[PDB]
Design an enzyme around this catalytic site. Structure first.
Site, mmCIF file in Angstrom:
data_model
loop_
_atom_site.group_PDB
_atom_site.id
_atom_site.type_symbol
_atom_site.label_atom_id
_atom_site.label_comp_id
_atom_site.label_asym_id
_atom_site.label_seq_id
_atom_site.Cartn_x
_atom_site.Cartn_y
_atom_site.Cartn_z
ATOM 1 N N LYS A 146 8.572 -17.950 -30.902
ATOM 2 C CA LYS A 146 7.926 -17.961 -29.594
ATOM 3 C C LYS A 146 6.561 -18.629 -29.652
ATOM 4 C CE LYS A 146 8.005 -14.606 -26.811
ATOM 5 N NZ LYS A 146 8.674 -15.237 -25.643
ATOM 6 N N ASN B 184 0.800 -1.217 0.000
ATOM 7 C CA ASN B 184 0.000 0.000 0.000
ATOM 8 C C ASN B 184 0.839 1.276 0.000
ATOM 9 O OD1 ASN B 184 -2.050 1.913 0.336
ATOM 10 N ND2 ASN B 184 -2.796 1.087 2.275
ATOM 11 N N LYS C 155 13.201 -25.870 -23.280
ATOM 12 C CA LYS C 155 12.105 -25.367 -22.471
ATOM 13 C C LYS C 155 10.970 -24.797 -23.292
ATOM 14 C CE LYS C 155 12.566 -21.600 -20.589
ATOM 15 N NZ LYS C 155 11.798 -20.695 -21.384
ATOM 16 N N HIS D 143 15.640 -17.354 -13.626
ATOM 17 C CA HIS D 143 16.328 -16.463 -14.541
ATOM 18 C C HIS D 143 16.875 -15.274 -13.768
ATOM 19 C CE1 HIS D 143 14.769 -18.143 -18.503
ATOM 20 N NE2 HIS D 143 14.180 -18.877 -17.578
ATOM 21 N N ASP E 258 8.298 -21.879 -24.100
ATOM 22 C CA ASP E 258 8.440 -20.447 -23.917
ATOM 23 C C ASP E 258 7.500 -19.964 -22.816
ATOM 24 O OD1 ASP E 258 9.616 -18.025 -24.424
ATOM 25 O OD2 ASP E 258 9.243 -18.112 -26.578
ATOM 26 N N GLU E 259 7.767 -18.756 -22.314
ATOM 27 C CA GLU E 259 7.009 -18.263 -21.169
ATOM 28 C C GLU E 259 5.543 -18.036 -21.513
ATOM 29 O OE1 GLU E 259 9.355 -16.039 -22.512
ATOM 30 O OE2 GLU E 259 8.202 -14.241 -23.015
ATOM 31 N N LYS F 212 20.416 -9.052 -24.595
ATOM 32 C CA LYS F 212 19.555 -7.988 -25.096
ATOM 33 C C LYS F 212 18.696 -7.363 -24.009
ATOM 34 C CE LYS F 212 15.949 -11.257 -26.227
ATOM 35 N NZ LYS F 212 14.721 -11.493 -27.030
ATOM 36 N N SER G 147 19.768 -16.248 -19.373
ATOM 37 C CA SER G 147 19.096 -16.280 -20.662
ATOM 38 C C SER G 147 19.017 -14.875 -21.239
ATOM 39 C CB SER G 147 17.690 -16.873 -20.550
ATOM 40 O OG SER G 147 17.033 -16.857 -21.803
ATOM 41 N N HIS H 229 10.146 -19.094 -14.225
ATOM 42 C CA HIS H 229 10.378 -17.994 -15.145
ATOM 43 C C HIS H 229 9.916 -16.693 -14.505
ATOM 44 C CE1 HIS H 229 10.391 -15.611 -18.867
ATOM 45 N NE2 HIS H 229 11.178 -16.555 -19.352
ATOM 46 N N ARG H 230 10.712 -15.641 -14.681
ATOM 47 C CA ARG H 230 10.495 -14.368 -13.998
ATOM 48 C C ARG H 230 9.781 -13.355 -14.883
ATOM 49 N NH1 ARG H 230 16.185 -10.973 -13.710
ATOM 50 N NH2 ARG H 230 16.486 -10.826 -15.978
ATOM 51 N N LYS I 160 12.212 -21.594 -30.532
ATOM 52 C CA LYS I 160 11.710 -20.471 -31.302
ATOM 53 C C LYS I 160 11.199 -20.944 -32.660
ATOM 54 C CE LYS I 160 12.926 -17.332 -28.306
ATOM 55 N NZ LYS I 160 12.072 -17.262 -27.091
HETATM 56 O O1 CAP Z 1 -4.618 0.690 3.981
HETATM 57 C C1 CAP Z 1 -5.361 1.700 3.934
HETATM 58 O O2 CAP Z 1 -4.991 2.879 4.101
HETATM 59 C C2 CAP Z 1 -6.837 1.419 3.663
HETATM 60 O O3 CAP Z 1 -7.217 0.343 4.459
HETATM 61 C C3 CAP Z 1 -7.592 2.693 3.992
HETATM 62 O O4 CAP Z 1 -7.563 2.886 5.350
HETATM 63 P P1 CAP Z 1 -7.954 4.538 5.743
HETATM 64 O O5 CAP Z 1 -9.276 4.629 4.992
HETATM 65 O O6 CAP Z 1 -8.013 4.616 7.255
HETATM 66 O O7 CAP Z 1 -6.830 5.341 5.123
HETATM 67 C C4 CAP Z 1 -6.995 1.061 2.174
HETATM 68 O O8 CAP Z 1 -6.827 -0.318 2.005
HETATM 69 C C5 CAP Z 1 -5.990 1.838 1.290
HETATM 70 O O9 CAP Z 1 -6.137 3.218 1.331
HETATM 71 C C6 CAP Z 1 -6.155 1.371 -0.138
HETATM 72 O O10 CAP Z 1 -6.013 2.497 -0.914
HETATM 73 P P2 CAP Z 1 -6.468 2.162 -2.569
HETATM 74 O O11 CAP Z 1 -7.938 1.855 -2.326
HETATM 75 O O12 CAP Z 1 -6.176 3.426 -3.346
HETATM 76 O O13 CAP Z 1 -5.611 0.958 -2.906
HETATM 77 O O1 CAP Z 2 11.694 -14.612 -24.556
HETATM 78 C C1 CAP Z 2 12.936 -14.656 -24.721
HETATM 79 O O2 CAP Z 2 13.621 -13.786 -25.292
HETATM 80 C C2 CAP Z 2 13.631 -15.905 -24.177
HETATM 81 O O3 CAP Z 2 12.878 -17.008 -24.565
HETATM 82 C C3 CAP Z 2 15.032 -15.919 -24.760
HETATM 83 O O4 CAP Z 2 14.945 -16.173 -26.104
HETATM 84 P P1 CAP Z 2 16.436 -15.769 -26.913
HETATM 85 O O5 CAP Z 2 17.350 -16.750 -26.189
HETATM 86 O O6 CAP Z 2 16.199 -16.005 -28.389
HETATM 87 O O7 CAP Z 2 16.673 -14.322 -26.547
HETATM 88 C C4 CAP Z 2 13.677 -15.803 -22.638
HETATM 89 O O8 CAP Z 2 12.521 -16.373 -22.089
HETATM 90 C C5 CAP Z 2 13.824 -14.339 -22.172
HETATM 91 O O9 CAP Z 2 14.968 -13.702 -22.634
HETATM 92 C C6 CAP Z 2 13.839 -14.316 -20.664
HETATM 93 O O10 CAP Z 2 14.752 -13.345 -20.341
HETATM 94 P P2 CAP Z 2 14.855 -13.128 -18.615
HETATM 95 O O11 CAP Z 2 15.669 -14.374 -18.299
HETATM 96 O O12 CAP Z 2 15.560 -11.807 -18.404
HETATM 97 O O13 CAP Z 2 13.403 -13.185 -18.190
HETATM 98 MG MG MG Z 3 11.096 -16.544 -23.543
HETATM 99 MG MG MG Z 4 -5.932 -1.096 3.819
#
Ligand code: CAP
Ligand code: CAP
Ligand code: MG
Ligand code: MG
Lengths: 447, 444, 91
Positions: free
Chosen positions: B158, B104, B182, B308, B184-185, B315, B360, B275-276, B156
């Site tokens: 993808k 938050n 692997k 990863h 692909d994502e 690249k 990767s 995968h990230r 590839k």
């Molecule tokens: O954590 C807080 O602050 C709240 O519980 C509000 O409490 P108050 O009402 O006492 O501030 C809400 O979850 C956030 O404001 C979310 O904001 P949004 O809806 O923009 O994600």
């Molecule tokens: O989508 C792609 O590009 C890949 O398949 C690589 O293919 P190439 O090997 O042909 O580039 C990988 O998943 C990403 O690079 C992930 O990168 P990260 O590890 O930073 O998520």
């Molecule tokens: Mg990929």
């Molecule tokens: Mg809240």
């Protein structure tokens, strides 16, 4: 044995089609690109479209085993700085938000070719949208369940966020519910801690919710937070809330992930539970106007997968929010067809294909003085949450709930008489407090 | 009971506080609103993430707020350290951490920007997590490959390849010398390549390639989908087909679903590759978001056999020093703090087993000397487009990548310098490898 | 050295074998320091003092109890009538 022309080719060559026309089944994405010094706008746009689709940094030999033009995305327009990209319908899995958020935003945001990149909007085609269930209950069904029509429903967040034991948590819940608030909710940090375990909190607060319904005569609810570290745990907390007689559960969908969110939504429909969705950890995405994903995109993805409530954010509260863009999200959640409006930030017309609407929840640092402005923005179909504005009252929580309820009743009733809201909200509140002692102490303290 | 707005820095700013060994310390880089003091913004982050709100409430007196409140105990001009009491967090749930610290506070008006640079998990909290199902040491035995980085490759293009044609590229790469391939994502269950046909076909290609080369090959089948009840269904199918591996996008699939899949992935005896995807929405801008080393810590806590980390020379943007620190967080059992390598806190891992760092990106044969120097031999190298982009196919491309790595690794065990003699080492290797000669000619 | 969240292991390692050695004629485990790190792997009591007292609505006094006697022999019918007398009378 053909020996395809190998090597590395510019992305502009085979992923930029200015003469392309988007079909009514394609996914259109609008990116705000900040390319490298030297890298052209056309090349960066083509690089984004390639790596969210069949593309790769070199020409692979397996490109000749497919009809690429069937599947490859392509940037069909560059409006100075915004690049529109069209994705074929066949690229995505049916009824899964995870796949579209693994393609559009999965990999393209961290390329050396673009210094920054923001997904401003998209257009989910009706062909793709028909594969999604949508919200379980919606706005109209929910209002019938609570039996509360013609006004913005009022809620609140129990404060402080952490520390209260279940015995004292239900004591605060009862005070807020008894004082006028139609709903309360577990704060997003409160999942299950040693001071307030979940199985004790669920029992205690719903005893207060049942008790508060008896004296008031209206129907109250408490958004029990069922978020946990695993999908099976999140579900296990869902049936317990279901068998206690609760009308409501709450999930942090962004943190818990859309997969676990969709798993919970299926169960919440099978147990007859409305599902409030908290957008915690959203500003990591939609804060910087140069990088990330705008929240309207996450508001679209929510209604597809399905959530009865969502926070859209007050414009005047403590948290960030834009007056024009917040209105666009409210229309993008409640309406059925949203024409594109450059003023509101909407790039594409979005037809919602009969998906039922969503309550926009306005929460933040808001108090009684913000009621006239909130009613102007959200109108009737919305939730107003006063967490620190209810328990922050000088005379307790029940008195704070009464003042908040009186403020909304007076402002809405004055709007229904044709009287202006923005200009004379201060008046409306003053001759509403002239008869309510609590409202005077509410506006005396704040402002 | 007194009511009304009070400044945050009079309850949640405690410069004399000494962090315990059971506190989650977080380092925030803060850009306050012009006018808002640096320490005032730091206290707002501490209050509104643990027990705070914009006004004093009557319900504060019902608890010993000093026992649970988070407090900023240190400020380095721009980085504010905030200590979190142990009781604030649920046992064995990353989701509660990422709902409290980064849930938050990023959306306030007083902070124009906020980045979580680093975080410290205490051992007391770290014993409630399972950690990686297998780890580096167990997996190398399971594959029977030691003393070199393990070579992989993304298939590839993808998207687009049908199930039969996709399983032909997989067999070509594995037969050529890649240890694993692997999915692909973003390749999960598309109409052109449904998962039940892709799973059946590539596992026949894996077994057929494994029966010829004599080694142990594998394919990281992507089980990511739109629900946990469907990922578990896909994960069970992969185990029943005999595959060693599965694949999850642990950020687009979220952390609750990922933790649910990890629990099943261990019950089925599968290595789990994480995968990230979407990580660059978080850890790209140096002024807002969440650094990857925070997400790298969360992965080892919940449990992932691979991750990863991002090649430094590919690249995709990544920092040479920061990647080194993340590689240590995933492999070593205790990482001392180091300002140069981006680390802010000491991290005792409490006996959690290590994680393979997966390098990767847009990496080809020329980058092998740099990859081996940065990552060592306990890593994966993924040549997605560097294998299929070879001017003579994938089996020829997989050979060039395999020969380049072994030539660089062996010449490093010989004592020769790598970062200076990589070009010469690769040229001597290419003098006798025809596949490597073409790959070096084509790229760079 | 200890499995997380399992008392069976902590009592299998420490008091498992060392008590039966010839080299020691006597050995008593007087006390034990459970670390906080090993303490968070255990759930603790389900309810506790406060939740139990609220679940019974009794405060500010010790809670009276009793055991039904004779501890074997009474049929379920005669066993229950003794329970009714005790609870009705003030326990
Ligand atoms: O954590 C807080 O602050 C709240 O519980 C509000 O409490 P108050 O009402 O006492 O501030 C809400 O979850 C956030 O404001 C979310 O904001 P949004 O809806 O923009 O994600
Ligand atoms: O989508 C792609 O590009 C890949 O398949 C690589 O293919 P190439 O090997 O042909 O580039 C990988 O998943 C990403 O690079 C992930 O990168 P990260 O590890 O930073 O998520
Ligand atoms: Mg990929
Ligand atoms: Mg809240």
């Amino acid at each position: 044995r053909a020996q395809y022309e190998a090597g590395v080719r510019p992305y502009r060559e085979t992923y930029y089609d200015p003469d392309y026309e988007p079909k009514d089944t394609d996914l259109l994405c609008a990116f705000r690109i900040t390319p490298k010094p030297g890298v052209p706008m056309e090349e960066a746009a083509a690089a984004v479209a390639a790596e969210s689709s069949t593309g790769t940094w070199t020409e692979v030999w397996s490109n000749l085993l497919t009809d690429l033009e069937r599947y490859k995305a392509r940037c069909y327009r560059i409006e100075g700085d915004v690049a529109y990209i069209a994705y074929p319908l066949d690229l995505f899995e049916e009824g899964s938000i995870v796949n579209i958020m693994s393609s559009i935003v999965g990999n393209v945001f961290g390329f050396k070719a673009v210094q920054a990149l923001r997904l401003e909007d998209m257009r989910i085609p009706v062909a793709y949208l028909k594969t999604f269930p949508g919200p379980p209950t919606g706005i109209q069904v929910e209002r019938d369940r609570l039996n509360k029509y013609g006004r913005p429903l009022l809620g609140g967040t129990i404060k402080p966020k952490l520390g209260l034991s279940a015995k004292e948590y239900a004591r605060v819940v009862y005070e807020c519910l008894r004082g006028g608030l139609d709903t309360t909710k577990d704060d997003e940090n409160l999942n299950s801690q040693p001071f307030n375990r979940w199985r004790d909190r669920f029992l205690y607060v719903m005893e207060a919710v049942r008790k508060a319904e008896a004296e008031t005569g209206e129907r109250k609810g408490h958004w029990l937070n069922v978020t946990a570290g695993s999908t099976e745990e999140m579900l296990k907390r869902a049936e317990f809330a279901a068998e206690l007689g609760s009308r409501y559960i709450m999930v942090d969908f962004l943190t818990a992930g859309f997969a676990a969110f969709a798993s919970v939504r299926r169960r919440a429909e099978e147990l007859g539970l409305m599902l409030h969705c908290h957008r915690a950890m959203h500003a990591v995405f939609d804060r910087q106007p140069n990088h990330g994903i705008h929240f309207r995109v996450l508001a679209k993805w929510l209604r597809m997968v399905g959530g009865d409530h969502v926070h859209t954010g007050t414009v005047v509260g403590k948290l960030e929010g834009d007056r024009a863009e917040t209105l666009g999200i409210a229309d993008l959640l409640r309406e059925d067809y949203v024409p594109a409006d450059p003023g509101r930030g909407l790039f594409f017309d979005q037809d919602w294909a009969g998906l039922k609407p969503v309550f926009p929840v306005a929460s933040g640092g808001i108090h009684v003085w913000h009621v006239p402005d909130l009613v102007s923005i959200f109108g009737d179909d919305a939730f107003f949450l006063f967490g620190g504005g209810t328990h922050g009252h000088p005379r307790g929580s029940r008195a704070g709930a009464t003042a908040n309820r009186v403020a909304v009743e007076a402002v809405v009733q004055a709007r229904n008489e044709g009287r202006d809201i923005l200009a004379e909200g201060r008046e409306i509140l003053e001759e509403a407090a002239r008869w309510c002692p609590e409202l005077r102490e509410a506006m005396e303290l704040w402002g």
